[PDB]
Amino acid sequence: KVKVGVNGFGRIGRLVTRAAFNSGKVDIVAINDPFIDLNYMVYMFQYDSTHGKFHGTVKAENGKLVINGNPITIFQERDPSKIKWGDAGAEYVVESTGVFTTMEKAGAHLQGGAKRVIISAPSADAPMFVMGVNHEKYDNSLKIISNASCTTNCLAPLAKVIHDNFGIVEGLMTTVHAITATQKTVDGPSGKLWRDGRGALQNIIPASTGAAKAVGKVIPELNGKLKGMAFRVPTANVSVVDLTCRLEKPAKYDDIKKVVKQASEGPLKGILGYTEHQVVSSDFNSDTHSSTFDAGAGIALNDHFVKLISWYDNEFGYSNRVVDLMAHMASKE
Amino acid sequence: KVKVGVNGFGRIGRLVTRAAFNSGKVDIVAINDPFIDLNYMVYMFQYDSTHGKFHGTVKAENGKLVINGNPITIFQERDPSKIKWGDAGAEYVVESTGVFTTMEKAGAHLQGGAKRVIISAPSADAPMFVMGVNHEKYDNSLKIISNASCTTNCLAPLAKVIHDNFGIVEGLMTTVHAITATQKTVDGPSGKLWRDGRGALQNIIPASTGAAKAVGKVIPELNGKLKGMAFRVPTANVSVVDLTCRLEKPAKYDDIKKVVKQASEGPLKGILGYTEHQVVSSDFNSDTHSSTFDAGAGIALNDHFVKLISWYDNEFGYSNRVVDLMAHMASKE
Amino acid sequence: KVKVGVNGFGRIGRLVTRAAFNSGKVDIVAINDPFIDLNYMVYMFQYDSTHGKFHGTVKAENGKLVINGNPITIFQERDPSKIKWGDAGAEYVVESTGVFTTMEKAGAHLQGGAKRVIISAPSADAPMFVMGVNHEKYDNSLKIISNASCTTNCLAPLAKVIHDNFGIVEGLMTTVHAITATQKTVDGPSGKLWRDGRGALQNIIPASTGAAKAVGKVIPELNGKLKGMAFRVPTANVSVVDLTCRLEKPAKYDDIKKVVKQASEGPLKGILGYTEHQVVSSDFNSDTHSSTFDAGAGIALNDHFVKLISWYDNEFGYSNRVVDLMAHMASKE
Amino acid sequence: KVKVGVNGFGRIGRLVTRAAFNSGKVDIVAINDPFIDLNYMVYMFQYDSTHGKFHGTVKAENGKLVINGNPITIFQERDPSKIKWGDAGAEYVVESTGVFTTMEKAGAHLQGGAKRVIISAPSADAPMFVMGVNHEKYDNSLKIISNASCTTNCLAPLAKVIHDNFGIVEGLMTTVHAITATQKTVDGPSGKLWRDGRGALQNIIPASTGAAKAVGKVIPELNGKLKGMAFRVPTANVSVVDLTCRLEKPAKYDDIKKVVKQASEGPLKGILGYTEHQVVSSDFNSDTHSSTFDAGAGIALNDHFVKLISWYDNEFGYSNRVVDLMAHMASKE
Ligand SMILES: NC(=O)c1ccc[n+]([C@@H]2O[C@H](COP(=O)([O-])OP(=O)(O)OC[C@H]3O[C@@H](n4cnc5c(N)ncnc54)[C@H](O)[C@@H]3O)[C@@H](O)[C@H]2O)c1
Ligand SMILES: NC(=O)c1ccc[n+]([C@@H]2O[C@H](COP(=O)([O-])OP(=O)(O)OC[C@H]3O[C@@H](n4cnc5c(N)ncnc54)[C@H](O)[C@@H]3O)[C@@H](O)[C@H]2O)c1
Ligand SMILES: NC(=O)c1ccc[n+]([C@@H]2O[C@H](COP(=O)([O-])OP(=O)(O)OC[C@H]3O[C@@H](n4cnc5c(N)ncnc54)[C@H](O)[C@@H]3O)[C@@H](O)[C@H]2O)c1
Ligand SMILES: [Zn+2]
Ligand SMILES: [Zn+2]
Ligand SMILES: [Zn+2]
């Protein structure tokens, strides 16, 4: 029902667009990307190495991108403040370029007529929200918000269930993460983050992520109680979280399984998943969950000290959450 | 000085041979592998996808594998007890087939004239040793010993330094593991371990490992205080250990760095490495250390709860330890 | 209508089974595989790293494999002559183990009551058939036949069109081929084919193939006019043929495009594909064509000397052809 | 002996620097790169995912990059005309940024006092040279030249031997090429070349290359008689050429082997290699040859129609040729 503009037609931009048209929860009416012209958008959206060919129709007609018969205005602006979202009827803008993550930078979309902006990444100052965890804390005074990172959306739902039931005194997270567009095919320049410049195909690359720390924002009680890091590895998609945490109340591993499974079947349905199957990463490709608990993979040293494993399609899960978030916001208007 | 025989000419058998000739600490004089004839041995030893072409000469001559002008007797016996080690002058035998890990089976080499047997893998009932950790516990009454696994050799030296200085109350370990020969190119049968059957190129694959528990043996005080698991990922060589542990005594991260660096420069020199460089996995290709502490990659939530990162060439490092162990044994004769 | 048994429930076995339930052209009533028990078959069939989770239902009940409600008898015989195909009602047997490719070896299935056998690979003496090329040469007197290789099924339909219109004087073919189950994850023993033993993730591996020569069997006029080789590269699925040939009659590239596109829409519909899109290998994953001509990728030096490019899902395309051929065989009974 | 400056410290820039110091054929005295400061240069040059840690010393001292005790002046100029090559003592300048490949653009280095410029890539207008083929056609009047491409340097030497002995009537080339810096980790924008934007790890990507056509310039007699294309595949380094050519004079394959081997041991020593071993791509990592003929991989349909295979380290071979070319220029001077 809410009309949506997308800034940055990349992995997230394109898959948010897919999620939108597949679910019908929001309507994409405009897209901006200076480095992808209209004809190129048809090809990039239609064919996808990771998630296969788009199920539906896409073509260019009269300057518009037409997906499933729905025309979309196409902009080619480098400067976000110059995009005429208002003229196109875009009420919400998905900010998914990755270079406008502050409220100041993302707020440029308001000058073009956008009413609200959703940053598809962590923000230094924008309020972050995770569906199933704190999305009800949103209110209509917030015109610029963040949907956090893919990793945060994996960790937070799980952390909520564990904290709600047993309490997390302290925890340390590792994520084995699929490669992304920011990495390099071969050893190349990355002056700010030297390790991230090394060849992505050849290397396990340790990386710093504020994902664990970010969970402290969407779940205030866990503020300062979580830290983590990442290992980037040569897979095209799907990542996994490794949460090692100390519980303040005792819990058998079966108790943990029970409460997680219960959550996945109820209040966190579609967000937090649960499995006992012998899964590997490819089994979660195009899976729309934010987080899927791997029961068989976890290990318990004692009732107070455990390692919990959760899978996530970093591309497809997060993209769907962006749509869910916007659908929820629209319902409050 | 001591003469060595090698049963099995796989990744380990061949790299023990390389380490032996490169370091010159021992002399290979016999090899046994049914599935590999003499001409093929030259090829497999000379050319290596991971560690490159051998530095030195290798050729067949008079039915002998000649490495660096040193002839080596070859055997093709499927039954270990049928190998004439004594005739070829082999004092120590490196059992590296991986199917004779028990005291009974491994002892078969003795029947042939072998004086001592070194198992290059975990054993269910043979005394396990890790250089730098408990190798001084070796005495001359032991005829059949084990050098534990590649991962145990990475974790134990670090675990020793941390335990000796601050005391590990408890710890959970993750290892991001490069692919191995037991895995499959595409989804194939692995009846006992279903996840391991899945395509190695396509998947992050969780897997069980007894490395953390094995540290309990070589370091008795840590018995029952460590366990862990693995994630197999599509990289060719070099793995990494992720140890999340609670400490009883306070330990600022700078104090951890100090004691590990101190250990790397003194008693554990050559075994436990230390670095503050922005390293990735490939930087440890053909690194001979059992384990190299990654200072920049580790994180501390507080003085009692930390995540410690250590790299290892799961092939090269371990193979050299086997040679080092044999050299230590020879010095005790 | 015709009831089918599958020997060897591997990549081709499982995908032949998928193709059969998806097309409905035949009925799978029995499967044999000593190294995959009933419960394991459920897992291997349901989850696929390459082609995704099975669309439909699969489970074990009453000792039967039940797919979409249809019970399937499961055998665990190593000896082909000991499988009770007749009792299970299997009339045709798909021989897809890779180790019974001669008529003598494949004929063992007749002892257990099978009526005809279709070898899912090249055979040294069994008549080879390729859908769209020579399948109409099949007749009821042939009880054991071969569906050739994936590569042959790609090249032959293309070569047919080119020869029919312009005449191939001579040709040389290269196939850039995805990895398969026969390859190794790391340098391992392969005494018969040394290069094939080398790690499949790290290397481009030149390999021999009789695919081009086999086209001379299914297209007799081209006997002795074609030869080729292969490069194995680190991708999980989908391969491509590179055909360099001399033509007898003048052929503008636009004329080649015309006749190939004509064929793809007419008599070779569903077997030979045609595209002008900017495609890469993943765009053909789970594509059912035997061969898809890549218009933009090909090049013409002159009217008589050209390089033609054709893509194929080596797993999925070939598997459907096996089902197609069996349905055709049944039509001739 | 000749002092050299390097513009652009990328894969080629850095590996030309390695080649220079390893061979000692020229002296690097200056380097320019706006996107890599002094400290970062030390790291990027020392550590290399593909060719391992640099064998020697590297450090920053007094604003200089010091390799093996040799100080090197560092510039950070975006505009090549502003680089004081002269003051730094650099006579020749290797232009290896990939964005100054024209004579007008590369000529900017002369304004800074450089005497000659070698473009480490094909040029639209600068004369191209390939060591072993037409380097003797270089003369002192030429201030701005090109060393062509890696692929041209692989194909031309081979083409020379074949054309000289048997005459190439016509030929078509395919190169299976390892990934490069211009490719993307995941589906991303590549506006002028759509296929090159697709994920490099996931895809076999067909691509255009003027390598075969370029051979016609370094070998005038073959002008218009060759063309080709490339398949990009997910390997970090080492590529292979596949030359399918028709010959005017009869040539048994043994005769082809003979003349190629003969050249590898004589005038083309170090440029054109010859092997009959069962090699795979990784065996040529850090191989300094421009082209190594794979005797066992090639095939002949008849005495006039053959497919010849040749390997090349696209990074290391080319870099050493840049140095050889400069050394040759200096010998004339
Ligand atoms: N890929 C993931 O798994 C993932 C998951 C969660 C969040 N994110 C975050 O989403 C954001 C985008 O990530 P991505 O993977 O889609 O990267 P991407 O490179 O695939 O896409 C980003 C793009 O935005 C375009 N762009 C660049 N500058 C622009 C500008 N000034 N104006 C408009 N468009 C511009 C680019 O052409 C490109 O298409 C990042 O912040 C990322 O951290 C990514
Ligand atoms: N993978 C491809 O792309 C492709 C394409 C065309 C043809 N083929 C051919 O099909 C055949 C199988 O190929 P694949 O890729 O499925 O190999 P695969 O290894 O994936 O499966 C073959 C199997 O047969 C089973 N098996 C082994 N011995 C058996 C026995 N005595 N009895 C019953 N089952 C047994 C194995 O358990 C395994 O499941 C081969 O001949 C192959 O050349 C493969
Ligand atoms: N990589 C190969 O295999 C190969 C083989 C043959 C030829 N080449 C050619 O060599 C050239 C470089 O290729 P590459 O593989 O090293 O890619 P690369 O990305 O690694 O190197 C290009 C670089 O030059 C730097 N640079 C960019 N703009 C600059 C500027 N204005 N001034 C100074 N430095 C600048 C960049 O920091 C970067 O290091 C290309 O033209 C390529 O076609 C590459
Ligand atoms: Zn039932
Ligand atoms: Zn028919
Ligand atoms: Zn010009």
**Contact assignment for D283 to B43 by CB distance below 8 Å:** no
Asked if residue B132 and residue B62 are part of one domain, the reply reads yes
Contact (CB, 8 A) for B143 and B117:
yes
Nearest CA to ligand 3 atom 27: D97
**Per the annotation, does B120 bind a ligand?**
yes
**Whole-angstrom Cα distance, residue B7 to residue B5?**
7
Strand ranges (E), C188-332 = 205-208, 226-232, 239-247, 272-275, 291-294, 299-302, 305-312
Resolution of the solved structure (Å): 2.3
Tokens (6 digits) for B121? 């893998």
CATH code of the domain in which B33 resides: 3.40.50.720
**Whole-angstrom Cα distance, residue C230 to residue C292?**
18
Tokens (6 digits) for C129? 């058939």
CA-based nearest residue to A94, from A51, A33, A48: A33
**Whole-angstrom Cα distance, residue C94 to residue C25?**
14
* Experimental approach: X-ray
Angle at C174 between CA C171 and CA C179, to 5 degrees: 150
Looking up tokens 């000692």 gives D24
Question: What does the DSSP 8-state code read for residue A186?
Answer: S
Subunits in contact with chain A (3 or more CB pairs closer than 8 Å) = B, C, D
**Whole-angstrom Cα distance, residue D142 to residue D120?**
15
The 3-state DSSP class for residue B279 equals: coil
| Chain B interface, best mutation among A301, A302, A306, by max B CB count within 10 A | A301
| Ligand 2 pocket residue status of C10, Cβ below 6 Å | yes
CA-based nearest residue to B148, from B211, B207, B93: B211
Q: What is the length of chain C? A: 333
**Contact assignment for B278 to A238 by CB distance below 8 Å:** no
> What amino acid occupies position A1?
K
Asked if residue A289 and residue A154 are part of one domain, the reply reads yes
Asked if residue A162 and residue A241 are part of one domain, the reply reads yes
Tokens (6 digits) for D225? 């008689």
CA distance A66 to chain D (A): 20
Residues 6+ apart with CB under 8 A from A134: A218, A219
Contacts of B53 in chain D (CB under 8 A): 283
Q: What is the length of chain A? A: 333
The 3-state DSSP class for residue D311 equals: strand
Report how far Cα A119 is from the mean position of its chain's Cα atoms: 10
Asked if residue C218 and residue C178 are part of one domain, the reply reads yes
Residues 6+ apart with CB under 8 A from B292: B272, B273, B274, B275, B284, B310, B311, B312
Asked if residue B9 and residue B137 are part of one domain, the reply reads yes
**Whole-angstrom Cα distance, residue C209 to residue B310?**
44
Name the β-bridge partners of B145.
B118
**Whole-angstrom Cα distance, residue D239 to residue D34?**
30
CATH code of the domain in which B276 resides: 3.30.360.10
Asked if residue D127 and residue D194 are part of one domain, the reply reads no
CA-based nearest residue to B185, from C150, C208, C186, A202: C186
**Contact assignment for A206 to B302 by CB distance below 8 Å:** no
Looking up tokens 């320049």 gives A189
Phi, psi of B293 (to 5 degrees): -65, 125
Report how far Cα D226 is from the mean position of its chain's Cα atoms: 19
Contact (CB, 8 A) for B285 and B50:
yes
Residues 6+ apart with CB under 8 A from C250: C166, C303, C304
CA-based nearest residue to C162, from C274, C257, C239: C257
Asked if residue B156 and residue B135 are part of one domain, the reply reads no
Asked if residue D117 and residue D24 are part of one domain, the reply reads yes
Please name the helix (run of DSSP H) or strand (run of DSSP E) that holds residue B310, with its range, or none.
strand B305-312
Mutation pick for ligand 3 pocket among D6, D7, D9, D12 (CB with most ligand atoms within 8 Å): D12
Phi, psi of C115 (to 5 degrees): -95, -40
Domains in chain C, number? 2
Contacts of B52 in chain D (CB under 8 A): 285-286
Could you write out the DSSP letters of every residue in B156-211? HHHHHHHHHHH-EEEEEEEEEEE--TTSBSSS---TT-GGGGSBTTT--EEEE--H
Mutation pick for ligand 2 pocket among C120, C235, C316 (CB with most ligand atoms within 8 Å): C120
The chain C residues in contact with chain D (CB within 8 A) are 170-172, 174, 176, 194-195, 198-199, 202-206, 225-229, 231, 233-235, 238-240, 242, 244, 246, 278-282, 294, 297, 299, 301-302, 305-307, 309
The 3-state DSSP class for residue A303 equals: coil
Asked if residue A239 and residue A327 are part of one domain, the reply reads no
Contact (CB, 8 A) for A14 and A48:
yes
| Ligand 3 pocket residue status of D34, Cβ below 6 Å | yes
**For the CA of A182, the nearest ligand:** 1
| Chain B interface, best mutation among A177, A196, A244, by max B CB count within 10 A | A244
Asked if residue C310 and residue C194 are part of one domain, the reply reads yes
Q: What is the length of chain D? A: 333
**Whole-angstrom Cα distance, residue A310 to residue A305?**
17
Question: What does the DSSP 8-state code read for residue C35?
Answer: T
**Contact assignment for B286 to D52 by CB distance below 8 Å:** yes
Subunits in contact with chain D (3 or more CB pairs closer than 8 Å) = A, B, C
The 3-state DSSP class for residue C173 equals: strand
The 3-state DSSP class for residue D83 equals: coil
Contact (CB, 8 A) for D319 and D19:
yes
| Ligand 3 pocket residue status of D313, Cβ below 6 Å | no
Helix runs in chain A, H state only: 11-23, 38-46, 85-88, 103-106, 150-165, 211-218, 253-265, 316-332
The 3-state DSSP class for residue B9 equals: coil
Adjacency order of strands within the sheet including B92-95: B73-75, B27-32, B3-7, B92-95, B116-119, B144-146
| Ligand 2 pocket residue status of B188, Cβ below 6 Å | yes
Is D245 annotated as catalytic? Answer: no
Please give the residue range of the domain that contains residue A253.
Answer: 148-314
Asked if residue D7 and residue D125 are part of one domain, the reply reads yes
CA distance A50 to chain B (A): 11
Distances (CA, A) of D45 to D29, D36, D49: 15, 11, 11
Asked if residue C128 and residue C224 are part of one domain, the reply reads no
Q: Given A49, A53, A283, which is nearest C47 (Cβ)?
A: A283
| Ligand 1 pocket residue status of A149, Cβ below 6 Å | yes
Name the β-bridge partners of A64.
A61
CA dihedral of B148, B151, B154, B159, whole degrees rounded to 10: -80
